[PDB]
Design a protein around this ligand. Sequence first.
Ligand SMILES: Nc1ncnc2c1ncn2[C@@H]1O[C@H](COP(=O)(O)OP(=O)(O)NP(=O)(O)O)[C@@H](O)[C@H]1O
Ligand SMILES: Nc1ncnc2c1ncn2[C@@H]1O[C@H](COP(=O)(O)OP(=O)(O)NP(=O)(O)O)[C@@H](O)[C@H]1O
Ligand SMILES: Nc1ncnc2c1ncn2[C@@H]1O[C@H](COP(=O)(O)OP(=O)(O)NP(=O)(O)O)[C@@H](O)[C@H]1O
Ligand SMILES: Nc1ncnc2c1ncn2[C@@H]1O[C@H](COP(=O)(O)OP(=O)(O)NP(=O)(O)O)[C@@H](O)[C@H]1O
Ligand SMILES: [Mg+2]
Ligand SMILES: [Mg+2]
Ligand SMILES: [Mg+2]
Ligand SMILES: [Mg+2]
Lengths: 155, 155, 155, 155
Amino acid sequence: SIDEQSLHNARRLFESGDIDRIEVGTTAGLQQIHRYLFGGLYDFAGQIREDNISKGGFRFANAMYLKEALVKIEQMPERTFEEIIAKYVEMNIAHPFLEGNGRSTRIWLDLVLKKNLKKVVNWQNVSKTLYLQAMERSPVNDLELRFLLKDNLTD
Amino acid sequence: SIDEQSLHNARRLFESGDIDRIEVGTTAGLQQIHRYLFGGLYDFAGQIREDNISKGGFRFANAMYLKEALVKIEQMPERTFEEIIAKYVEMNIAHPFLEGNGRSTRIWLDLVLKKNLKKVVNWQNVSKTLYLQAMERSPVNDLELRFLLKDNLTD
Amino acid sequence: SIDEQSLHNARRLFESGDIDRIEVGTTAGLQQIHRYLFGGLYDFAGQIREDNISKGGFRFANAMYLKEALVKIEQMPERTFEEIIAKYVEMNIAHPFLEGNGRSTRIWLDLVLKKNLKKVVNWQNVSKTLYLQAMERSPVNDLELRFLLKDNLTD
Amino acid sequence: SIDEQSLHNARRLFESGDIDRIEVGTTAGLQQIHRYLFGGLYDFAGQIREDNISKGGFRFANAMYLKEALVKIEQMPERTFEEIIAKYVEMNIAHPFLEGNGRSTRIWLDLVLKKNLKKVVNWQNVSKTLYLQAMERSPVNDLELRFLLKDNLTD
Ligand SMILES: Nc1ncnc2c1ncn2[C@@H]1O[C@H](COP(=O)(O)OP(=O)(O)NP(=O)(O)O)[C@@H](O)[C@H]1O
Ligand SMILES: Nc1ncnc2c1ncn2[C@@H]1O[C@H](COP(=O)(O)OP(=O)(O)NP(=O)(O)O)[C@@H](O)[C@H]1O
Ligand SMILES: Nc1ncnc2c1ncn2[C@@H]1O[C@H](COP(=O)(O)OP(=O)(O)NP(=O)(O)O)[C@@H](O)[C@H]1O
Ligand SMILES: Nc1ncnc2c1ncn2[C@@H]1O[C@H](COP(=O)(O)OP(=O)(O)NP(=O)(O)O)[C@@H](O)[C@H]1O
Ligand SMILES: [Mg+2]
Ligand SMILES: [Mg+2]
Ligand SMILES: [Mg+2]
Ligand SMILES: [Mg+2]
């Protein structure tokens, strides 16, 4: 119910035109997206977490310095695909919500790609298995992720 | 060459009593230890890194917010073995030097244990292989590290 | 869809009494469980994989020597809780199917615990988050898994 | 002491021309290299391990089926760079010795590349940091390793 309802909310975000009101490339913009997707579903919708979380051997940015990290991440440049991917990779490492980081930050990435490069990711053609592998590796080396995503951009 | 002299430098730190002048439980204190062990050996002795580093697939705190991270980590409480281990785990994730984090931060840990618990680690009885495993796991769960060290304390 | 239907099959395995005919602690027994759960749902139901697979940075036993590995794994002893967990850990590393290893092998584990200790895991009280973490760690050290499961055995 | 003495033996393996007498692409050939490097230094020189080992959170092939694994791995083809790297990656996962797998298996790799492609790796121009990263990743995805090594091939 939660994930189907948030998918409907994501659809609403685009169909409504409310997507055009989201700040691009900023922490606030990511919060806007998360609040939109999960509002009325998670009580923490749009809110930066205060608890620590991990997945698959990686511990995401410690909540005690997550806000400081986000301030630095949102200032990263967006001039090229490689810069945009690097910025996305650091926002994923920040992982600022208890849940729904993936969906919200992928929308956030698409807005950055669209603003700067006039392209978005064609997610329907991206393997979820290969995407997860590439994201898991990305804090160490974003090569796999860049190869995967660059092949799946659409203008 | 470097490791041999730095081991001599660590013995001098203790045997001279210079160890008693090290600030306990702080970033500055860790820098003091690192400067003492590696002064004249690494030109970055005592200095917070500006480059990014990883080991075993784990990305240590990004250099862009590392200084900010350290300000927070050093304020962590030190009242119990579990608190002190948690603080140590976070200082390891920070990994604030290019090299020599292990040796420096273990001395740092012992000073915190000594101050607050009147105990230090009996490293003589700790397997390096098992210690490395526990440290690698610690960001996700410090159970292995607590299991390894707690009954290896000595007063 | 597949998950809801396989769950129904797993309930039927127990409710029908068919569970009592499953060979305990063997590769063939694991295959019997997988075929029952996934027959008609995955065309590879019950079948040892010929493709390589990975999760979270760990590559499961190479398909080229998987059958050989399974021959050794099923011979492992089941004399104590700790031996049984060790055997379960090796069967998870083998990871013999393309999908459904988790559900099938947890049933397989319970049959081994029941046969040798007259216990099963009370999975209802086991955190999925902590279980996944413990499984991810288990190839290196099964301490987390033993801590988790021993606290959740039932008669 | 052992690392320096083994380097000298490695030096001699090439200086003497004995490298030309080593069996190429086989388990026996790898054991020959390991014995040349470490015979008289490690008591287990040239011997397939009977103990389990791991590094960086990765469990190498279980000793109970390591021999069976090696029988399969040595049969892997060697016709393309990609096949040769895949074979090397599997021999590293097998990790057949207690110690000295890296040095011995890199020599083994060069012999297979030399035989089949008339090239070897120019290890002088390969970053040890990037190499270890690429090795750690290789069981999941050998792209990093292939990217790192292919443009460092020489004759
Ligand atoms: N080990 C890891 N290291 C770094 N990033 C990871 C790791 N595991 C998962 N990720 C990323 O974290 C995301 C999942 O975060 P989560 O907060 O569960 O988002 P979600 O929207 O609920 N699920 P999803 O749609 O699967 O992304 C994945 O899509 C990956 O981008
Ligand atoms: N994958 C990992 N994840 C988290 N921590 C790690 C990892 N690998 C190593 N460590 C920790 O990092 C330390 C090594 O950092 P490093 O900067 O190499 O210190 P060192 O003093 O040069 N070597 P050592 O004496 O082996 O600790 C180890 O002792 C562990 O505490
Ligand atoms: N990185 C890892 N290393 C070792 N084991 C893992 C890892 N990730 C997951 N596992 C185990 O693999 C199982 C999942 O295997 P899979 O074939 O997807 O089974 P499933 O029944 O489809 N899913 P689940 O019900 O979630 O177990 C998990 O339940 C864990 O036991
Ligand atoms: N986490 C890992 N996963 C896969 N392979 C690894 C991992 N860590 C290290 N390796 C590989 O194992 C080798 C080290 O094996 P080891 O038996 O220590 O050999 P060594 O010759 O003693 N050391 P080195 O000269 O550094 O390779 C490295 O060179 C890597 O190829
Ligand atoms: Mg999620
Ligand atoms: Mg070091
Ligand atoms: Mg699954
Ligand atoms: Mg070694």
